[PDB]
Design a binder for these strands. Sequence first.
RNA 1: CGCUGGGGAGGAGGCACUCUGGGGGGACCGCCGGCGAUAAGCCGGAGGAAGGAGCGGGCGACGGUAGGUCAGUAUGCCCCGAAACCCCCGGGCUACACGCGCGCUACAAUGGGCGGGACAAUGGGAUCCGACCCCGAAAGGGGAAGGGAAUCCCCUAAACCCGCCCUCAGUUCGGAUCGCGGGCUGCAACUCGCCCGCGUGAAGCUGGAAUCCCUAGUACCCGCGUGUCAUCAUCGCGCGGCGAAUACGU
Lengths: 64, 213, 149, 133, 100, 135
Amino acid sequence: DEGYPAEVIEIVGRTGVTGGVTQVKVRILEGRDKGRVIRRNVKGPVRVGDIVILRETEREAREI
Amino acid sequence: AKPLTERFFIPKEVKVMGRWSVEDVTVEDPSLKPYINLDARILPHSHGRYAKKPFGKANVHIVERLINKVMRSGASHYKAGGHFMRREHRSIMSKKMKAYEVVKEAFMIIERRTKQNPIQVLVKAIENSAPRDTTTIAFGGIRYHMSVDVSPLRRLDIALKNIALGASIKCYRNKTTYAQALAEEIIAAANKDPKSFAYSKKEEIERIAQSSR
Amino acid sequence: ATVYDVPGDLLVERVAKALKEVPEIKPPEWAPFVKTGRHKERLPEQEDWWYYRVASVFRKVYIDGPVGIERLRTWYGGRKNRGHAPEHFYKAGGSIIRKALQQLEAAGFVQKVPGEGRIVTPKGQSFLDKIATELKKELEEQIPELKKY
Amino acid sequence: RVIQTAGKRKTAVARATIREGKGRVRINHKPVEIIEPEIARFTIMEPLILAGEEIVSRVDIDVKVEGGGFMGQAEAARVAIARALVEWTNDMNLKEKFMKYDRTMLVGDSRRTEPHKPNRSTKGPRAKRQKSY
Amino acid sequence: QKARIKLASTNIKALNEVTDQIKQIAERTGVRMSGPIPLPTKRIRITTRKSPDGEGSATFDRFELRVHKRLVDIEADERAMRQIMRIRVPEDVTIEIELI
Amino acid sequence: NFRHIVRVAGVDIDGHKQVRWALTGIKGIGINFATMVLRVAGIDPFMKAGYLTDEQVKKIEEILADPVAHGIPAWAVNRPKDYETGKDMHLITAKLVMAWREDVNRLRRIRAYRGIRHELGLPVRGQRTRSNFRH
RNA sequence: CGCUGGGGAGGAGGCACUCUGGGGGGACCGCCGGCGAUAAGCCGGAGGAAGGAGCGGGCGACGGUAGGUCAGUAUGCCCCGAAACCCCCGGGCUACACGCGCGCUACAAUGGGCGGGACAAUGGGAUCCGACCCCGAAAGGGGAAGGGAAUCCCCUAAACCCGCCCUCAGUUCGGAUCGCGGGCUGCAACUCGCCCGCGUGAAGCUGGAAUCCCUAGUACCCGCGUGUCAUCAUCGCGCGGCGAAUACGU
């Protein structure tokens, strides 16, 4: 399976029981749902400008 | 024995170990492109200068990172391939020369058997061994095992660790050597063979994560 | 052209091969029944180890001369397996070094400064430098960067 | 004319001397092309390979280096050689090249050892025995 | 024809004193002196355990005594010795002079 | 032209190994004494066994029967200054076992510390038996 | 020396370089970006030897813990005079069916052996360090220059590199235990010391439940000095060599 790219644009805050997760807002580069901004969680160090590959685009994580 | 034109090797061009180029190498994953350092160098050795700074690892050449992974003892406080690998006096810990040579031989074998650039081979292997996981999150009092995505830098760390561990596995208390094992692992992961520890764990991790979505 | 332009490995090998024509350099009575030091476990495997040891002593007196026996002992010593106890460094034995130097003297390759050590003679110098010239001409076939030296 | 330079790397000190010549380089009386191991040889010769033939085939360099390990010696010699070449040429393209490659060629390395402390002093300052209660 | 002076002290005040004295002597007079030359400082370290008993975590006191060393050569004139030997030599300084 | 398992005094040693290491399978002979005996006999210890001529074997046995007479310094031997004869000698397996036995038994027969320790089965030399040496 | 182009050793003569050690300078969120009450401040970029009390240490407030030390010395009460006081000889604290803590060596090829090639720092040294010569297979023995220590000595460290043998085996892994012999210290080496040679060749094939230490010249790996000391270091206190992985959080 080839996922769908999306570009990080805003760090929200640190989540998780141990501080290993990070809530993020991403923009869909291209695919089916291009141009949409959603909210997603990400494990690991991140920064604005990074790219992530999503298997879904349709889970819309919960606000912290 | 090593011939003399190999024991006393003198480089003339800027080339990894004086032998292999980078301009013909091409990455394709837009997520990992900006973290795979392909700078033209001769000696991949940074002497621990880029550790303090948070994102200082994007300035280290892939080959130096792989050498540093290979510079290990095995598996302490966890089991790999079913068993602890504790060497503790016959380990290459703080010995970068041996890891350098191991990687060099592995690259030679890869070139011999593939007729391509071992750096392109390693790049495709990373691309195919990088996992796109699950953790534990509390939405207030209650905790759930959730599925979260991963970042490129952690992906790279994962892939390199897994390749090195695959080699250390296949070279454990057997007639095979560490260089041959590393070459086997790299070719397997690059052509997507389930014979590879790294591709195996990538598939397993994605499999589990898919469950707890 | 000089001992400093070639490695010590090939040079010691070739010097030992060449010392097999000097009649004053012959292994002694107890050579095949001893180790090279207490730090050693097993005795030497080669049958012509005397000549290699003598050649190395010769090159060392050349390089680091004037020098005596204790410093050469320190060079030829090493680490020891002590069993369940940890490893320590120990120095080698002296009779081998003494006999090697006495033989080189009788052959006229070294002399003793009266009070500090032993040095080479002009003929010893010529010996070594000629052998090194041969070896360097051979090596230049492979390492073309050595021609300028 | 003649020029002298120096280089430091932990506990090791190197002094280099450059003058007119053919392209020979010696480190403690022996050529740099038969230096072992390869990981030290490349270390020493990286600046020469960056400077090139049209600059190195006209000079002769001699380095006396003592103290602190073969890798430290090699790094110190590398530093000294880079400095000597930059000064002898008084060229700035070379300096920009060396800086974009690795700024520790011309600049040094300030790191030294941390002193050891009790509770297993021998091992290190921060390492300790283990407890089991 | 040269006299050699060795100065040793745990305090540098007396050393600066004596050395400026000798410099003024040999400058007001016609006589040459080489120095002063600082030799490496000699330090004595004694490390011991604080506790008088064996209980408690172990802690250590590091005590250090430092000794500074200076050297001079004065050319050994006659007026030189006569005007040098009679100088205020405090008790926190040790001096030794010899011939060469 | 290589015998794959040769039969030397008392023992049927392996020919697939070098001579210096095959002779090691005999009780009373280590690698070093073996190298000595072979250098005296005039045989290359670094060669695959099997071409051990009958006369070579006989000469090895001649040596093992009386090593000092054939050289073999008296300080490289198993039993110097024998308690009953002097006559530095080297034993292989049989009066070796028997000589160990006779030494221990003469120690017991006079009621000595070491003999009593041998009897009871405890450390003999000086060791501290409180924390280790658990059956 | 080869191809007169190169390379070494002295002793004159110098303080250029290194080093030594006294006196001064230099970094202050100072400049620029953003985030913050426009305040106190936070993150980042350059420049720079060094960047965010630069790094690492010493000095540890008022209090309390009936925490430990009368077996370091000092001291109240109680107790022991031919004695629990003062000296000599011999034994013991080293005893071993076992349960524990901290470690050393290993269970092998990310290796074992042989021969060759390299490369430190800290400290210490008068009946002390002992170069250099001669004996000895080794441990060690006989003479002995110099040195009160930037002058002499301890001191050519190991891991590392090269070539050859071994090729996955309780083995050329491992090295406990025991026999015969040779030495040192010391008034004395059995109980109860340390070293050397030849033989001997036990468990151990990566380790459950559980648990420890570590954010950079740090951790892992390697050896050395010094304290104790007539002799004896698998310890304490320190020294350099090679040198990472992860996180900039809760």
